[PDB]
Design a protein around this ligand. Structure first.
Ligand SMILES: CCCSc1c(F)c(F)c(S(N)(=O)=O)c(F)c1F
Length: 258
């Protein structure tokens, strides 16, 4: 099955998910001189209820914090979006060194990690599953992490990691103030793209925040101790789980700021 090791990692994904070589794949190199300022873009309109988070789990490919998406308590609107996108999922990508962990890369700068916040269009689709298959279905907010001061909200997550070391393990996790985790500036770039993991669907409006948030090197390194293997199977660690940048193929990357 797909992963990030030699035999199953990103260069091999196309073997099983041919859309891996499609025309709207993510992540991308963000080249600031090539981005177009677009005054029609709106500020982000962000509403995240800390009681929405319910469960943290090891998928084998990241941790996922799962939110109750029963109704519209936590929604992202504005930015480049038409309509309201409901909070589903948060997860993180990193690498084996603090030097190079993010998925989007900004004029050659890879950050230590990248947080993705996944939302779905409940104004047009009845469920996350239906939305994940359509071009306007998903919106993912990307937030870079750089090494700096320990992050008190991320410490809540690192504290759970011992309990979800094995693939498939979950534990209850709530009261996660996602809104306060975001950087002080919400200026962003946006472009049409895809999920960065299989099935790689071209369903995502990406919103990548320019300003990183910090994490300590100690906190970040606790993520690499997750296993990508389930209880009772040869142990292998999830030391790195970022996909390389993909060709832009004529897509417009827009900035909400100049
Ligand atoms: C139909 C499957 C969707 S679950 C999922 C996702 F929706 C993402 F956007 C991402 S991401 N990295 O594109 O934001 C992700 F990693 C996921 F696991």
């Amino acid at each position: 099955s797909w992963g990030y090791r030699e035999h199953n990692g990103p260069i091999h994904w196309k073997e099983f998910f041919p859309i891996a070589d499609g025309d709207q794949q993510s992540p991308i190199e963000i080249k600031t001189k090539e981005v177009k300022y677009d005054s029609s873009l709106r500020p982000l309109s962000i509403k995240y209820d800390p009681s929405s988070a319910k469960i943290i789990s090891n998928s084998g490919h990241s941790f996922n914090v799962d939110f109750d998406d029963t109704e519209n308590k936590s929604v992202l609107r504005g930015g480049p979006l038409t309509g309201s996108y409901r909070l589903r999922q948060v997860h993180l990508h990193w690498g084996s060194a603090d030097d190079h962990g993010s998925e989007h890369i900004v004029d050659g700068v890879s950050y230590a990690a990248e947080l993705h916040v996944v939302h779905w269009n409940s104004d047009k689709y009845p469920s996350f599953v239906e939305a994940a298959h359509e071009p306007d279905g998903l919106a993912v907010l990307g937030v870079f992490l750089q090494i700096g001061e320990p992050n008190s909200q991320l410490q809540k997550i690192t504290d759970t990691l011992d309990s979800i070391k094995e693939k498939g393990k979950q534990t209850r996790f709530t009261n996660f103030d996602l809104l306060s985790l975001l950087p002080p500036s919400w200026d962003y770039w946006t472009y049409p793209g895809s999920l960065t993991v299989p099935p790689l669907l071209e369903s995502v409006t990406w919103i990548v925040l320019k300003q990183p948030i910090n994490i300590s090197s100690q906190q970040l390194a606790k993520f690499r101790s997750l296993l990508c293997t389930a209880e009772g199977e040869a142990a292998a660690f999830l030391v790195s789980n970022h996909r390389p940048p993909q060709p832009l193929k004529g897509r417009k990357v827009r900035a909400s700021f100049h």
